[PDB]
């Protein structure tokens, strides 16, 4: 039940995830081809950008999803792995990504924290029993360098996150130099 | 040691603060004319926007500074009060605002959390002994609706927080 | 952690549910027009037939689905209320019932046990973190008269449970 | 929370300090050139003269500062290292020493006890949360031979301290022989 | 074992003392005519200046002694009472003041803390079993506003303490 | 806080003492020439005759002091070391022995029990915080063979003590044979 | 196990005693005519002089014995009561006083502390199981003003104790 | 505080005793010639006949003492050692045996249980603090074969004790055969 | 496990007993005509003489037996009641007194302590599981004034106990 | 205080017993010739038939005693040892067996459970403090195969016991076949 | 786990029983017409004779069976009620009595101790999980006057128990 802040080690985890990318391209030889297990050891040397939201089927003002799909290149260029998380099942992730045209090409994985152990460990599980809208940046040493949490149904600003990451990785001093 | 998150009651507080507004536009009747005491009960019905930073006298970006001053009206119009915090003394707030031209016209108060009790209560005091670079939004019920924390020396985006507040109010 | 058996009081509950009945036959006055809150006190004098499954959006057999809809009248005639349960959100129930033709006309409500408190109280939450594939029959005294649990992905026989209910009522 | 007296070992410490001396002379290649870490092991064989005050930006009647700058030679001549301490940050020390013309040449370091661990350990932290106006003399064996504490906004008398130190180091008997 | 600092309440006390003033100028009606009992309640509204030393009959500097006697008026004028203390007996105070010409005219009382209870309560009793060489200034609220402690055999500066008292009173 | 009786071991001790004998004869090269440390191991093979009194500056009816100075020969003749004790400082002992003409030649040492540890250990410290008027005789085995304690301001009878010692050392049976 | 010293309350007591005075000058009406019970309450306003010895029938010196009898008047004149004590039985006191010419005229009572409770309470009972050779002087408040203890078989000086009592009374 | 019965081990003891026999015959070179230490190990192979009484100076109806002096031969003939005990001192025993003409020749020792440790251990110490009138017979194995206790001032019957001892040592069955 | 001694209260008791007196001189109206219950309250004002033995049917000496019967009058005349005790049953007392000519005329009662509670309370029950060969004399206050215990098979002397009782009464 | 049932191990025991058989035939050289010690290890390979009764001198309706004397042959023929028990002394057993003409020839031993330890261990001691009327059959493995307990003054039926034993030893099924 | 003996209170009980008497002579109005509930309070003033056996359907001897039926009158005449017990179900009692000619006319009830609570309370439940072969006689005060237990498969003697009961009643 505690929430983590700057400097804290991000929790270990091992969760089933819906793969990123175009769903129609993976060969459909068995259902398990759509899913994988992802661990806290999965992205060595990379920064991890972790997005929690309460429930699949979210309809907040962003619009941020198309920006995920275009900006994953910017994250990769910055040795950054995007990871999305809710407590919904991988089949809910699957359902969400397959028929919401915008999500058909989401380029990064969707983790199912169905035991809530990770949401719990991160301090993100709320009184309704779901993950709050929270963003974490974790450095290659597994140390949190940024966390953002939002109430209600407020959309996330990803471009701000790119700026924050860049400033963290480059020692740029001014919010104004990012373009 | 605990960090508050959305939905938590923001801590009570009572701290000496350097006043907001045009700093040169003040009578020298007492040193205390530049200072006030600020409490969690002081603005009923207002949203409270709290900015923690580690230390005054560190380089801060001007574009981030202009707004507040251009946007302070936009926060005010919707019953939102800006509040700044570090553990430095109120005289340090005074000095920072008195000698650096950008801060001369800062429109909001600067609170001095010198015993670090509030930084402790919010969960923002870090291993270096200072308040983390943190933003809180508190609704009229003293309830947190937004929290943001940053490592190192990353500049803050005030326009983003205005965006968030407006969206929180719809 | 305890599984209820025959004679045990079925747990109290209060959960958001997707309504039963023709799903397309509903006014779009609010999103909440598709949803309701359901409690253990809601149908005094009725038998309650509770079906738990792990996850929506898994393949389910159509012949098992038709009845309910052909047999729902037979359950209803003898004061029996059908209830479905998974831990998925009510929006997942909505999506499953909205996009798969077989479920478009499902005549009974779908409850979302998202905190998993009821799955816990019934003893059906398993090591994978989900409700077991379980059926309960509860008499008008809130007393369990039948329980069934299944591993894996075995399809349920609704006609058998109707048989059992009828025999329990004689 | 205890205060130390004659004969007690002065606490160990390790604190960031603003360097003494003319600020304009150190090369400004990076900010860290203005600061150092100072430890209780930093001045072997020397007596340590430790001055606590509540807050930078102090405006008490002394005048003592110019006397620091002239008297550091007397302290050094007496194998004595002057050390000033408040809980303000090294940037507050920096601000204080750079634009108060009198402080521009303060010849000894300014320590930042921002965690209050040293003020706490010495018994100097007060009910307002700051270091009281206290002077300590510590011998080369780390043993306190003199402590003075003052309320409010009373200025310190440094010449008295020189006399006390001299009498401690020379076994002079009379307050009257010092000149 | 605890040493009091600024702001602490000075301990209560009740001790036999050798009187201040011209020592030869006293009637020999009883031995007790040379002695009195002194308490913490004895001078309401006065500041109290307390000097502890280890042992009487040790060499003390005359220039430090003259004032008190030239400056005793200056302390008195502003409601300040001088008090001397060692753990030696009151008869030792008597002997020291009776046989050493410098002390013949000492204008203030000498208290005998023979059980060492006050030295203990002030935190001044040291590892040699004696009161440290200590000065306290106590305000009319019994609150310490100044404390000074010295090792060894360093002579005290009375003029400095007068300076401090005057400044404390402004 | 307990008082010792016949057969008990006298406490160990280590105390600063004012030397016995003519004060004007010892060379005054430094103050420390007037004083020594005396321990419970200081007089091997000797009986110890220990006199406690409350305060230096005592003016009781004896007169016993001149008898100390004449009778120390009798004590020595009897392998007996006289030891006087109060809680006053060695400087008080010094003051007492230097200007009371009678005490100028006191031939035995004056111990300062300023920590009261010995008065405490012997059971001699009283409710006023000082040593009661008590006499002990301790045999070469450190065993008490006689103790006498007196209230108020009653003078001690030393000749009685000589008789007691002699009877203890000679197995003389009658109070009447001593002359 | 504790030995009383000056200022301590002398213990309460109630013991059978052989009477003082000319022993042959007594009626043989009962054996008990030679004996009495003595308590700590028996002589209000008197000083009490208590002599403990280990055992009766041991050689005691005559010169020490005459006074008491010549000096008993001097003790009596100033409200002082002499009391003797051993743990031997009262019949042993009787025998000692009845057969040894010196004791025939002993003017004060001899108490028998046969259970050794008083020797215990005064702290005088020793490792041999007997009362030490001890003298106490007790003032009219039951308060000890003098105590003396001796090893072995040292004869007591009664004249010294008279001296001390007189001086205690001035 | 417990009293011992048939079959119990008699307590160990080590006590000063007044010797038995004619007092005028032992050479009077020192007082210690009249006394000895007697232990529970003092009479190996012998039965021990132990008589407790409250106080020396006893004047009960027996008359038993002359019978002690004549019957000690019968006891010895029966490997029996007579032992008398009270809590009075050996000097009280001495006083009793020296001038009561009847006791001048008491042929067995008189033990002083002045610490009451033996009276206590045997269960013989009474509420007045003295040994009750009790007789014990202890066999060569230190085992009690007979105990008799009497209230008040009732005299003891020694001839009965001889009969009891004889019956114990001979397996005689009848009280009537003893003569 | 504790043995009572002089001065101790003799235990309370309530036991079946074979009557004293000429045994053949009794009506056979009931078996119980030969038996009675005896308590510690039964003879107020009498001394009680209690004899314990291990087992009936063991050889006992006749001369010791005659008195009681010749001396029973002497005990009775001074308010003394004889009482016999073993743990054997009352029928064993009956048999012993009925078949052995010496016992036919035994003038006092024989108590059966079959649960051994009294033997326990008096402290006379031994390691063989039986009452020791013990005599008690108890005064009218239920207070023991004499106790005697014997090993083995030593015959008792009744004349001695009569002597002792008479002397106890003077 | 517990009572034993089928399948339980019979308690260990070691008790003095009056011998069985004609009393006049054993040579009367000493009393101890009439008695022996009997232990739970005394009858290896035999079944033990144990009869408890409250008190010697019993006069119940059986008549069973003559049947003991005639039936001991049947018991022996069946490897069975009869044992009688009460808490009365062996002298009470002796008295009972010597003058009740019927008992003069009782062919089996009479045990004295005078410490009640066996009656206690078997659960047979009653609120009056005596053994209840109880019968046990114990197999060669020391295991109880039958127990019978009766209130009051009801006589025992030994022929029933023979039948029970025979059925236990032969696997005969019917109560009717015994003759 | 404790076995009751003579003098112990027989346990309370309440058990379903197969009725005694001619079994074919009963109306088939309900299955329950063959069954009753029996309690320890059901026959005030009667002696109760309780027979436990391990299992029905084991060979039992006919001669032992006839009486009861010839002797049931003799028990009844003196206020004695026969009761049979095993842990088998009442339907097993029914089957045993219904199909085996000897049992067709059994005149007393057969209780089913199916939870084994009474077998437990009487101390008769054995290591095989069944009631020992046990007989109890209980007097009108619910007090046991006789108990018998047997190993293995030893046939019971009913005539002996009648003998014992008669003798207990005299």
SS3 assignment, position I83? strand
Is E157 in Cβ contact with D175 (below 8 Å)? yes
Say how far apart CA A22 and CA C16 lie, in whole Å: 33
A4, A14, A42, A45: which is closest to A145 by C-alpha?
A4
Cis-peptide into D176, omega within 30 deg: no
Other CB atoms closer than 10 Å to residue A55's CB: what's the count? 20
Q: If you write DSSP's letter for every residue of A28-42 in order, what string do you get?
A: -SSGGGGEEEEETTS
H or E stretch at B38: strand B35-39
Say how far apart CA B105 and CA B118 lie, in whole Å: 26
Strand partners for K82: K49
Chain F 43-62, CB below 8 Å of chain E: which residues? Answer: 55-57
Q: If you write DSSP's letter for every residue of chain D in order, what string do you get?
A: -PPP-TTPBPPP-EEEEEPPS-TTTS--SSGGGGEEEEETTSSTTSEEEEEE-S-SS---S--HHHHHHHHHHHHHHTTEEEEEEESS-HHHHHHHHHHSGGGGG--S-EEE-TT-HHHHHHT-B-TTSSB-EEEEEE-TTSBEEEEEEE-TTPPP-HHHHHHHHHHHHH----GGG--
- Indicate the Cα dihedral angle A112, A114, A119, A120, nearest 10°: -160
Angle, alpha carbons F66-F70-F72 (nearest 5°)? 110
- For the record, the structure tokens of F109 come out as 């040492």
For helices G90-99 and H90-99, give the axis angle rounded to 10 degrees: 50
Other CB atoms closer than 10 Å to residue H105's CB: what's the count? 18
Say how far apart CA H79 and CA H43 lie, in whole Å: 10
Distances (CA, A) of E125 to A60, A80, D7, E90: 72, 65, 12, 18
- Indicate the Cα dihedral angle A20, A22, A25, A27, nearest 10°: 30
Cis-peptide into A29, omega within 30 deg: no
Strand partners for J16: J37
Say how far apart CA I96 and CA I89 lie, in whole Å: 11
Say how far apart CA E79 and CA E69 lie, in whole Å: 16
Strand partners for A143: A9
H or E stretch at C68: helix C62-69
Residue F7 and residue G127 in contact, taking contact as beta carbons nearer than 8 Å: yes
Residue A57 and residue C91 in contact, taking contact as beta carbons nearer than 8 Å: yes
Say how far apart CA I135 and CA I124 lie, in whole Å: 10
Residue D152 and residue E168 in contact, taking contact as beta carbons nearer than 8 Å: yes
Which residues touch C77 (CB under 8 Å, ≥6 apart)?
none
Say how far apart CA C130 and CA I90 lie, in whole Å: 80
- E43: buried, middle or exposed (CB in 10 Å: 19+, 13-18, 0-12)? middle
3+ Cβ–Cβ pairs closer than 8 Å linking D and C: no
Say how far apart CA C121 and CA C118 lie, in whole Å: 5
Distances (CA, A) of A57 to A41, A92, C94, F145: 29, 9, 10, 100
List CB contacts (< 8 A) between I138 and chain H: none
Which residues touch F117 (CB under 8 Å, ≥6 apart)?
F13
End-to-end CA distance of chain A: 39
Cis-peptide into G169, omega within 30 deg: no
C-alpha distance from H96 to closest chain G C-alpha (Å): 9
Q: For K86, which DSSP code?
A: E
- F123: buried, middle or exposed (CB in 10 Å: 19+, 13-18, 0-12)? buried
Other CB atoms closer than 10 Å to residue H95's CB: what's the count? 23
Residue D74 and residue D178 in contact, taking contact as beta carbons nearer than 8 Å: no
Distances (CA, A) of H45 to H36, H51, H138: 20, 19, 11
Say how far apart CA H82 and CA H48 lie, in whole Å: 6
Residue F61 annotated among the catalytic residues of the structure? yes
Say how far apart CA B53 and CA A69 lie, in whole Å: 34
Residue D160 and residue E157 in contact, taking contact as beta carbons nearer than 8 Å: yes
Which residues touch I112 (CB under 8 Å, ≥6 apart)?
I15, I16, I17, I18, I86, I87, I88, I89, I90, I92, I93
Report strand pairing: J47-52 vs D14-18.
unpaired
Residue E119 and residue E125 in contact, taking contact as beta carbons nearer than 8 Å: yes
Say how far apart CA E150 and CA D5 lie, in whole Å: 9
Partner-chain residue, chosen from G57, G128, G129, that has the shortest CB–CB distance to H92:
G57
Cis-peptide into F63, omega within 30 deg: yes
Instruction: Note whether J98 contacts I: Cβ–Cβ < 8 A.
Output: no
J2 φ, ψ to 5°? Answer: -100, 150
Say how far apart CA J87 and CA I114 lie, in whole Å: 9
Other CB atoms closer than 10 Å to residue F2's CB: what's the count? 14
Instruction: Note whether H88 contacts G: Cβ–Cβ < 8 A.
Output: yes
Residue E65 and residue E20 in contact, taking contact as beta carbons nearer than 8 Å: no
Say how far apart CA D116 and CA B125 lie, in whole Å: 13
Angle, alpha carbons A165-A168-A172 (nearest 5°)? 105
List CB contacts (< 8 A) between G90 and chain H: none
List CB contacts (< 8 A) between E114 and chain F: 87, 128-130
List CB contacts (< 8 A) between H152 and chain I: 145, 168
Instruction: Note whether D113 contacts B: Cβ–Cβ < 8 A.
Output: no
- C30: buried, middle or exposed (CB in 10 Å: 19+, 13-18, 0-12)? exposed
Q: If you write DSSP's letter for every residue of chain F in order, what string do you get?
A: -PPP-TTPBPPP-EEEEEPPS-TTTS--SSGGGGEEEEETTSSTTSEEEEEE-S-SS---S--HHHHHHHHHHHHHHTTEEEEEEESS-HHHHHHHHHHSGGGGG--S-EEE-TT-HHHHHHT-B-TTSSB-EEEEEE-TTSBEEEEEEE-TTPPP-HHHHHHHHHHHHH----GGG--
K34, A156, F129, K120: which is closest to B167 by C-alpha?
A156
Say how far apart CA K10 and CA K3 lie, in whole Å: 10
- Indicate the Cα dihedral angle D169, D171, D172, D178, nearest 10°: 0
B128, closest residue in chain A (CA to CA): A7
Distances (CA, A) of C149 to C87, C154, G28, I74, J104: 17, 10, 111, 97, 79
E122, E37, E106, E43: which is closest to E79 by C-alpha?
E43
Report strand pairing: I133-138 vs I47-52.
antiparallel
Residue A17 and residue A56 in contact, taking contact as beta carbons nearer than 8 Å: no
Report strand pairing: I80-86 vs I110-112.
parallel
Report strand pairing: B144-150 vs K133-138.
unpaired
Is I155 in Cβ contact with H7 (below 8 Å)? no
Distances (CA, A) of K19 to A122, D6, J134, K49, K94: 70, 101, 33, 16, 9
Distances (CA, A) of J44 to I98, J9, J31, J41: 41, 15, 28, 6
Residue J68 and residue J106 in contact, taking contact as beta carbons nearer than 8 Å: yes
Q: If you write DSSP's letter for every residue of I97-161 in order, what string do you get?
A: HHHSGGGGG--S-EEE-TT-HHHHHHT-B-TTSSB-EEEEEE-TTSBEEEEEEE-TTPPP-HHHH
3+ Cβ–Cβ pairs closer than 8 Å linking J and I: yes
Strand partners for G85: G52, G111
Query: Structural domains in chain A?
Result: 8-170 (3.40.30.10)
Say how far apart CA C70 and CA C63 lie, in whole Å: 11
Say how far apart CA H43 and CA H37 lie, in whole Å: 13
Q: Per the residue annotation, which of I6, I26, I61, I66 is the catalytic one?
A: I61
Partner-chain residue, chosen from D127, D146, D175, that has the shortest CB–CB distance to E63:
D175
SS3 assignment, position A66? helix
Say how far apart CA H86 and CA B25 lie, in whole Å: 109
List CB contacts (< 8 A) between F91 and chain E: 55-58
Active site residues of H: 61
F114, closest residue in chain E (CA to CA): E129
Distances (CA, A) of G159 to G46, G66, G133, I137: 19, 11, 17, 56
What count of residues does chain J have?
179
Instruction: Note whether C9 contacts A: Cβ–Cβ < 8 A.
Output: no
Instruction: Note whether I92 contacts J: Cβ–Cβ < 8 A.
Output: yes
Partner-chain residue, chosen from H57, H91, H115, that has the shortest CB–CB distance to G55:
H91
SS3 assignment, position G102? helix
Report strand pairing: B110-112 vs B133-138.
unpaired
Say how far apart CA B72 and CA B161 lie, in whole Å: 12
Residue C82 and residue C138 in contact, taking contact as beta carbons nearer than 8 Å: no
G8, B57, I155, D58: which is closest to H178 by C-alpha?
I155
Active site residues of B: 61
């Amino acid at each position: 039940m505690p929430l983590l802040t700057i400097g804290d080690q991000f929790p270990a985890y091992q969760l089933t995830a819906l793969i990123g990318g175009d769903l129609s391209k993976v060969d459909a030889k068995q259902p398990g081809d759509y899913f994988t297990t992802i661990t806290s050891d999965e992205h060595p040397g990379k920064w991890r950008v972790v997005f929690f939201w309460p429930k699949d089927f979210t309809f907040v003002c962003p619009t941020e999803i198309a920006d995920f799909s275009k900006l994953n290149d910017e994250f990769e260029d910055r040795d950054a792995q995007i990871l999305g998380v809710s407590i919904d099942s991988e089949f809910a992730h699957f359902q969400w990504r397959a028929q919401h045209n915008d999500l058909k090409t989401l380029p990064f994985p969707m983790l199912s924290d169905i035991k809530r152990e990770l949401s719990q460990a991160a301090g993100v599980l709320n009184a309704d029993g779901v993950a709050d809208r929270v963003t974490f940046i974790v450095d290659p040493n597994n140390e949190i360098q940024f966390v953002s949490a939002t109430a209600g149904s407020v959309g996330r600003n990803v471009d701000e996150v790119l700026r924050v990451l860049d400033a963290l990785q480059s020692d740029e001093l001014c919010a104004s130099n990012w373009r």
